[PDB]
Design a protein around this ligand. Structure first.
Ligand SMILES: *[C@@H]1O[C@H](CO)[C@@H](O[C@@H]2O[C@H](CO)[C@@H](O[C@@H]3O[C@H](CO)[C@@H](O)[C@H](O)[C@@H]3O)[C@H](O)[C@H]2NC(C)=O)[C@H](O)[C@H]1NC(C)=O
Ligand SMILES: CCCCC/C=C\C/C=C\CCCCCCCC(=O)O
Ligand SMILES: *[C@@H]1O[C@H](CO)[C@@H](O)[C@H](O)[C@H]1NC(C)=O
Lengths: 48, 48
């Protein structure tokens, strides 16, 4: 039973979030974590 | 340089942490090979 949130019309601080998380592995294509910290995208859907 | 294996994904391409931004940033225009090696204690005490 995993939670899902959708964030639209929003702004966020990457340094605030990454100060609390020790990332061990990221895998993805069509985008990069550097791109998510620089570019602007239409919507953001997060599952955790 | 020295870096723990718990943050081996920090040097992965596309990462957005502070190491890949302000510290050593890898150049990928030439054939590289990043190696994460662990030097054991006995051979480390042998060669100072
Ligand atoms: C969220 O992002 C903002 C920037 O987009 C980060 O803001 C900066 O935070 C540091 C402290 O974490 C601030 O430093 C402080 O500055 C005052 C200025 O006089 C100084 O007196 C203090 O001793 C301290 O050094 C810095 O000013 C601030 N920059 C801004 C607001 O433009 C913030 O760190 C990020 N959030 C987290 C949780 O890291
Ligand atoms: C790790 C953060 C967890 C929560 C993130 C959720 C929402 C924020 C949305 C976009 C920011 C992109 C995350 C940056 C990934 C860093 C990967 C790494 O440093 O290797
Ligand atoms: C599933 O998660 C939602 C989100 O908080 C919660 O409201 C719900 O009670 C959960 N259901 C369970 C634990 O059976």
């Amino acid at each position: 039973n995993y939670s899902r949130r959708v964030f639209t019309n929003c702004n966020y601080n990457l340094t605030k979030l990454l100060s609390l998380v020790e990332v061990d592995e990221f895998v993805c294509d069509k985008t990069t974590p550097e791109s998510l910290a620089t570019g602007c995208y239409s919507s953001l859907v997060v599952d955790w | 340089f020295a870096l723990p294996l718990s943050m081996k994904s920090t040097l992965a391409i596309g990462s957005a942490e502070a190491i890949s931004m302000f510290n050593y940033n890898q150049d990928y225009s030439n054939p590289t090979c990043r190696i994460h090696a662990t030097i054991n204690s006995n051979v480390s005490s042998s060669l100072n």
